[PDB]
């Protein structure tokens, strides 16, 4: 039962940390595409305001 | 957000300054032609009052 106590500090809800793993992955693939859009919009300033 | 503050001094409304750019260009092509007319009228003093 001490080993049980050892688990309830170090043990992983592998389902949980997988959920936060893919959650964070999605929120790391998303803002990338946003950075694309931001680094793509002023091209129409150059090419259509001018 | 400090960089935002940095922009709101140095940043250009490129549309705006383009508008004043062409506005000023028009008002720099116009008075030229006026200077032509002024430097062309007295020719008829010489050539028709005389």
DSSP labels for A17-48?
HHHHHHHHHHHHHHHHHHHHHHTTTTHHHHHH
Q: Enumerate residues 6+ apart whose C-beta is below 8 A from A49.
A: B14, B15, B18
What φ, ψ does residue A40 adopt, rounded to 5°?
-125, -20
What is the spatial distance between Cα A12 and Cα A7, in angstroms, rounded to a whole number? Answer: 8
What is the spatial distance between Cα A43 and Cα A36, in angstroms, rounded to a whole number? Answer: 12
What is the spatial distance between Cα A10 and Cα A1, in angstroms, rounded to a whole number? Answer: 14
Distance of CA A21 to the CA centre of its chain: 8
What φ, ψ does residue A30 adopt, rounded to 5°?
-65, -60
Closest alpha carbon within chain B to A49:
B15
Give the resolution to one decimal, in Å: 4.5
CB B15 within 8 A of CB A49: yes
What φ, ψ does residue B35 adopt, rounded to 5°?
-65, -35
CB A50 within 8 A of CB B18: yes
Closest alpha carbon within chain A to B19:
A49
Which approach determined this entry?
A: cryo-EM
The C-alpha of B26 sits at a distance from chain A's nearest C-alpha, in angstroms, of 16
Interface of B with A (CB under 8 A): 14-15, 18
CB A49 within 8 A of CB B17: no
């Amino acid at each position: 039962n001490l080993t049980a106590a050892e688990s309830r500090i170090r043990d992983v809800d592998m389902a949980k940390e997988m959920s936060e793993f893919t959650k964070n992955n999605i929120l790391s693939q998303a803002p990338q595409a946003m950075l694309a859009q931001a680094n793509q919009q002023p091209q129409n300033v150059l090419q259509l305001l001018r």
